[PDB]
Ligand binder design. Structure first.
Ligand SMILES: CN(C)c1ccc(C(=O)N[C@@H](CC(=O)O)c2ccc(Br)cc2)nc1
Length: 164
């Protein structure tokens, strides 16, 4: 069902796209959220995915945190995909703007290996403060399952492809 992606490796594909619009079109089995440990979906990819669910993602997430407590940086949980996907894999990459350890980015991407195919953003990019070129390299060197990366910024997409 994924179309228009550029093949980077045997299992990693990339496209300049809005992940909300991509999820609505494909209805993938798994969409990845760029979550924080509290599952507070305020901004970035998480704010956009939650807004597209009419806040149902945040209501489910608040019940999950009330029962389980916060996730670990580098960890994940599987919740509903609502109207976007069958499932949402909420993955916590390190937030460099909060002083978190960038080495945890490889542990964050290892969560993707529990799912055969995923629609995902680049972890720790954007408002999480990491270098997206680095994030793409860790993705390619860590994920072994089939990952379809949606890169929102056209200018960054071009830089990622040309420097790969
Ligand atoms: C509205 N939603 C869907 C998004 C909100 C935010 C983001 C997001 O921060 N994306 C990252 C990586 C990327 O482009 O994918 C980013 C954006 C701009 C610059 Br400049 C640098 C990095 N991605 C999506």
């Amino acid at each position: 069902s994924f179309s228009g992606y550029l093949k980077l490796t045997d299992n990693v594909y990339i496209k300049n796209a809005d992940i909300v619009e991509e999820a609505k079109k494909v209805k993938p089995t798994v969409v990845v959220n760029a979550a924080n440990v509290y599952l507070k979906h305020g901004g970035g990819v998480a704010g956009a995915l939650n807004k597209a669910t009419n806040n149902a993602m945040q209501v489910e997430s608040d019940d999950y945190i009330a029962t389980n407590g916060p996730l670990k940086v580098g960890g994940s949980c599987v919740l509903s995909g609502h109207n976007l996907a069958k499932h949402c894999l909420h993955v916590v990459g390190p937030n460099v703007n909060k002083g978190e350890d960038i080495q945890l980015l490889k542990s964050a991407y290892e969560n993707f290996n529990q799912h055969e195919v995923l629609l995902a953003p680049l972890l720790s990019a954007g408002i999480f403060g990491a270098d997206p070129i680095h994030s793409l390299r860790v993705c390619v060197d860590t994920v072994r399952t089939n990952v379809y990366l949606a890169v929102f910024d056209k200018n960054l997409y071009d830089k990622l492809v040309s420097s790969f």
